[PDB]
Structures are given as C-alpha cells and as structure tokens.
C-alpha cells in the first residue's frame, strides 16, 4: 500500500537556492527566493527531514553536490527530497554560470546508481521556468531503475513560472502551506493536488506590462511512485 516511512531517519532535504547569477550570463536576480528557501527549511524540518541549504551554486557545484549526495549511505533513511530554486527552461535548471540538464541531476539517484535509496521515494521539487509561454487563463525480483521518482514542477511544460519578490514564488508558498496544513492527514499526491488548486485559483499576476499582466499558473506533478506516501 504505502512506502515504509519508519526508518530511523526521514532522510535528507537538499535545497539549492540560486538568487544571483554571473553578470556574463545576463540572468536576472531572483528576488523573493530567500523567502522560499527559509519557508522550505522550516516546513521540512517540521517533517523531520535533515535539511541542507546551499546558495548560489555554479552548474559544476550543483552536479558535484548531487553526485556526492547520491554517494552517501541512505540505508537508515526513508526517503530523499531535493528542492531546486533557480531560473530554468524546459528540461534545464540554471547554475549561477550556466545550465544543467535536470535528467543529469536526477539520474544520480536511479535505482541502479543509488542502492541505499532503491525502493524509496525520491522527490524532486522544481521552482524554475519551463519556457516562455504565458497562461491567459479563462473566466470560470527486479524493479525499474526509473521507479519511485516524483517530480513536482511549479508550472506547465513550456511555461514561465511566477515568483513574487516580496512573498516568494506562487508554487513554493502554496506547497509549504499545504504541507503544514495537510501532512498530518493527506497522502502526498492529494497534498500536491491541493497545491495545484491553490496556485491555479488564488494567484494572478499584476503588471504594468500588458504582455505580463493578468496571467495564471498550474503546477504539474510527474509521478513514477509505486506506493502511497504519508509523512505521518
């Protein structure tokens, strides 16, 4: 039915918080991202994850961190969580100096490549753009090596993802709120569905630029999990 979550440790929560980018890249500063990083740290600490925050990592440091983490002994840990806060494009998240393929990052944790996490949920939470589209909205015994991954993307494929410079990103704000409210009673997919509704219904952009004004967002869950996940 459900994943075993009563190992002595819930597991690691790796938070990569990229705010400032090398001038040569031409990428903008991500105001509000520190609000996300603090919110996530508290939220996951409260769920008994061992949280590690890293700020402003190059593309090389990102890859090296994830490799190092995949090489740890996770035998006593129930699960693994990685949160990525950066610029992105479809399939890609940005280090401070350039892009990294998301598949490169997640592949370190494949069932054949990280044995101490085989059969355990590996959760990737991604706040980053997936392209440049804008949503105008509408008035209303072996196991597969790719098994047991969940990718929780902030936005639909092809689309921008929205971040408030004061309040933090729409997705991370909502994710943390729903985890706080529901982690003690809902299964993870149902929590994420509540996140989808919150983002989709409660948020709409405001801009003096007509092209960017009155826009909407829907997060996108990719589940390759084989069991239900309860945090309690």
């Amino acid at each position: 039915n459900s994943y075993k979550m009563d190992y002595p440790e819930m597991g690691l929560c790796i938070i990569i918080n990229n705010k400032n980018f090398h001038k040569s890249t031409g990428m903008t500063s991500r105001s509000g991202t520190d609000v996300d990083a603090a919110n996530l740290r508290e939220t996951f600490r409260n769920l008994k994850y061992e949280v590690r925050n890293k700020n402003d990592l190059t593309r090389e440091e990102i890859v090296e961190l994830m490799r190092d983490v995949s090489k740890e002994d996770h035998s006593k840990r129930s699960s693994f969580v990685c949160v990525l806060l950066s610029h992105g494009e479809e399939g890609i998240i940005f280090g401070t100096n350039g892009p990294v393929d998301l598949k490169k990052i997640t592949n370190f944790f494949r069932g054949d490549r990280c044995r101490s996490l085989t059969g355990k949920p590996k959760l990737f939470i991604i706040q980053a753009c997936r392209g440049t589209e804008l949503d105008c909205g509408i008035e209303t015994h072996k196991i597969p090596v790719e098994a047991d991954f969940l990718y929780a993307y902030s936005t639909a494929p092809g689309y921008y993802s929205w971040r408030n410079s004061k309040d933090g990103s729409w997705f991370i704000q909502s994710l943390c709120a729903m985890l706080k409210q529901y982690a003690d009673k809902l299964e993870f997919m149902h929590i994420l569905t509540r996140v989808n509704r919150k983002v989709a219904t409660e948020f709409e952009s405001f801009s003096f630029d007509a092209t960017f004004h009155a826009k909407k967002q829907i997060p996108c869950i990719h589940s390759m999990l084989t069991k239900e996940l309860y945090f309690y």
Binding site: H87, C129, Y160, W162, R163, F212
Partner: peptide, 4 residues
C-alpha cells in the same frame, strides 16, 4: 510579480 516576476517570471523565473
């Protein structure tokens, strides 16, 4: 509101 800003985009990533």
């Amino acid at each position: 509101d800003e985009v990533d």
